[PDB]
Structure 1
């Protein structure tokens, strides 16, 4: 149990789950910013 408490809920249930959704928002926002940069048509 001392070996397996490394994977223990140190930061609590609410924070671990929220962090996951925060990273989801971060990753998705990175995705549309990068795709809008690649997809923009500056040239006439």
Structure 2
């Protein structure tokens, strides 16, 4: 992003219109970089992980509880 912007500035210093169009396409690529699967913060990322870990543990525990529960002597 910043490298592409600096390259556009270098092209302006050398001078072109094609390079500015390339900078606009890079901004479209940036919008893709805002949303290629982006949606959450660092804190939220931490809470979701803890909740998923707790769910797996509880499900495994319930399954083991009935694993031991042997109906037939």
TM-score by length of 1: 0.69
* Whole-Å separation in 1 of the counterparts to 2:58 and 2:68: 15
Task: Indicate whether 1:16 and 2:33 are aligned.
Answer: no
Q: Number of matched residues?
A: 44
Give 1:42 shift: 3.4
Q: Larger Rg: 1 or 2? A: 2
TM-score by length of 2: 0.47
* Whole-Å separation in 2 of the counterparts to 1:9 and 1:3: 9
Q: Once superposed, which parts of structure 1, at least 4 consecutive aligned residues long, lie more than 3 Å away?
A: 1-9, 41-44
Structure 1: gaps spanning 5 or more residues: none
Give the root-mean-square deviation of aligned CA atoms: 2.0
Q: Give the helix-richer structure, 1 or 2.
A: 2
Structure 2: gaps spanning 5 or more residues: 1-29
Give 1:27 shift: 0.1
Greater RCO structure (CA 8 Å; 6+ sep): 2
